[PDB]
Amino acid sequence: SIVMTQTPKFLLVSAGDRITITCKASQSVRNDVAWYQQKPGQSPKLLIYFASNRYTGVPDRFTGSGSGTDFTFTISTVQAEDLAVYFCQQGYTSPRTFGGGTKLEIKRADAAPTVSIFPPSSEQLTSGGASVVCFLNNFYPKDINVKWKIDGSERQNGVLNSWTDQDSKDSTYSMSSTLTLTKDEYERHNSYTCEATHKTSTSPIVKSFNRNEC
Amino acid sequence: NVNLLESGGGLVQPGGSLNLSCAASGFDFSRYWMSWARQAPGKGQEWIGEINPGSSTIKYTPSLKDKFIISRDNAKNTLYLQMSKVSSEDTALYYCARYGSYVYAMDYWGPGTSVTVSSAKTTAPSVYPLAPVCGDTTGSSVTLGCLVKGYFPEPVTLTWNSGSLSSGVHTFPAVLQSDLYTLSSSVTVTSSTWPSQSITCNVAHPASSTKVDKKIEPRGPT
Ligand SMILES: *[C@@H]1O[C@H](CO[C@@H]2O[C@@H](C)[C@@H](O)[C@@H](O)[C@@H]2O)[C@@H](O[C@@H]2O[C@H](CO)[C@@H](O[C@@H]3O[C@H](CO[C@H]4O[C@H](CO)[C@@H](O)[C@H](O)[C@@H]4O[C@@H]4O[C@H](CO)[C@@H](O)[C@H](O)[C@H]4NC(C)=O)[C@@H](O)[C@H](O[C@H]4O[C@H](CO)[C@@H](O)[C@H](O)[C@@H]4O[C@@H]4O[C@H](CO)[C@@H](O[C@@H]5O[C@H](CO)[C@H](O)[C@H](O)[C@H]5O)[C@H](O)[C@H]4NC(C)=O)[C@@H]3O)[C@H](O)[C@H]2NC(C)=O)[C@H](O)[C@H]1NC(C)=O
Ligand SMILES: [Cl-]
């Protein structure tokens, strides 16, 4: 089977810049190469076919070129809406194998996270569990660290984190952190804190509550 | 107006069998080559196989040529994928795709149907409303949330006010721990809005026929 080796695997570009992705085929595939774009939460769309032809309705900023084993795909001026995974495919012989993809991320101005903390819901406490939730929303760049403290002591066991894909509309990231205890352990302590460390501030962002006090 | 819609996905035990369907409309199905592809969690797209209009040519990726069978019904405008002897590496979103006229390029892809290969048990979610305490606000807006815990398999669908509220929403990817998923979502509205305008998280988990509405109610000053 023909191998399509796609590079780079990741791209971080500012809006307005030019990007070029490369696909190298393990043997010649004539001009039988297609390029696809897959935005977050959507199915792939065909952009380029027969190596260098734009598919119907594809805007001018997308082009492809190449023949034989060497192929490139270019966005002349990247737009924020172009955030997506891009991948090549050869259609010369079966199996019609895909490249491994390139994830295109957009550079934007720094943004500090908006942090909110939530004690366990009484509905969950009735069932014997206790999850504390911290949302860290609309920040940039993506690298961020969250620390949980219980009565001042760092807690790592029981923490589950999830991250959104970069937003195509504001180019930010968001994150959710959930600390799950038993109701019994939760009631053994009074102060719960989520601390966010991010390049925008020298100081951590600290959100806290006390079970008994406001 | 071209449309493809896959169905039939869901949980299947390892070694079991599952048939996927792909309903087509808006073009002359009998004149087009059709194909299947899949995207496993964290991986790129993988081409599965193709079938020509008359079903006289059917091709597969070698690793799948003995597990999967592709077929089509031109009279019913439907493409099929017969999965058998499935294993954990067959867990993926499965896509059906049309080939463009006289090209081996996939010019229209369906939304996909999710397949999970696992022996973990189907479990219904618990849905928990999240409201701030002590009057916690970020400036002129408040953030509420919804926590969905303890379910299997994916997917859960979460909306706010039955989808009427979509601005200011972050719904986070489900995370698996010890064969159960956690999912959460936050919604940020202006302080004036809530609680005078009610906000409700709606959670659907077809695998357990769970459909839950949880209104967010204050537990602190507003
Ligand atoms: C996914 O889709 C596929 C495809 O479906 C189509 O496409 C989809 C997308 C839809 O549109 C759908 O609507 C379409 O139809 C589904 O595949 C179908 O699955 C059904 C089963 O659910 C199969 O139906 C069975 O067919 C058997 C005969 O099949 C052979 O012939 C077919 C026609 O040519 C051929 O298509 C088959 O591939 C198969 O061909 C043979 O294959 C073997 C090995 O692969 C080769 O060695 C042969 O050479 C080859 N021959 C040929 C000519 O090619 C029927 O026998 C079977 O009937 C039995 O089972 C049903 C229950 O399912 C019972 O109700 C019946 O009464 C009957 O029961 C049997 O009764 C006898 C007694 O008379 C018992 O014998 C006794 O047994 C004892 C031991 O237990 C002793 O041995 C005793 O001495 C002995 O007498 C049997 O035990 C008993 N068996 C059972 C199980 O109870 C049935 O009709 C379709 O063939 C199949 N079609 C295709 C194309 O694959 C698939 O199901 C679906 N999956 C899912 C998950 O949705
Ligand atoms: Cl592939």
Numbering used by the authors:
A (entry chain L): 25 to 238
B (entry chain H): 15 to 236
Question: What's in the article?
Answer:
Sequencing and annotation of the P. falciparum genome has supported the identification of new blood-stage vaccine candidate antigens, among which the P. falciparum Cysteine-Rich Protective Antigen (PfCyRPA) has a number of noteworthy properties. PfCyRPA is part of a multi-protein complex including also the PfRH5-interacting protein PfRipr and the reticulocyte binding-like homologous protein PfRH5, which binds to the erythrocyte receptor basigin. Moreover, PfCyRPA-specific monoclonal antibodies (mAb) inhibit parasite growth both in vitro and in vivo by blocking merozoite invasion. Here, we describe the crystal structure of the promising vaccine candidate PfCyRPA alone and in complex with the antigen-binding fragment (Fab) of the parasite growth inhibitory mAb c12.
The parasite inhibitory anti-PfCyRPA c12 mAb binds tightly to PfCyRPA with a Kd of ca. 1 nM as determined by surface plasmon resonance analysis. This mAb recognizes PfCyRPA independent of its glycosylation, as revealed by Western blot analyses. Because of these favorable properties, we chose c12 for epitope mapping by determining the structure of a PfCyRPA/c12 complex. In a first step, we determined the crystal structure of c12 in isolation. We obtained three different crystal forms containing a total of four crystallographically independent Fab molecules. The four c12 molecules superimpose onto their variable VHVL di-domains with an average rmsd of 0.35 Å, which reveals a minor spread of the elbow angles between 133.1° and 135.8°. The high structural congruence indicates that the CDR conformations are genuine and not dominated by crystal contacts. Third, consistent with the similar conformations of the CDR loops in the individual c12 Fab structures there are negligible conformational changes in the c12 CDR loops when bound to PfCyRPA.
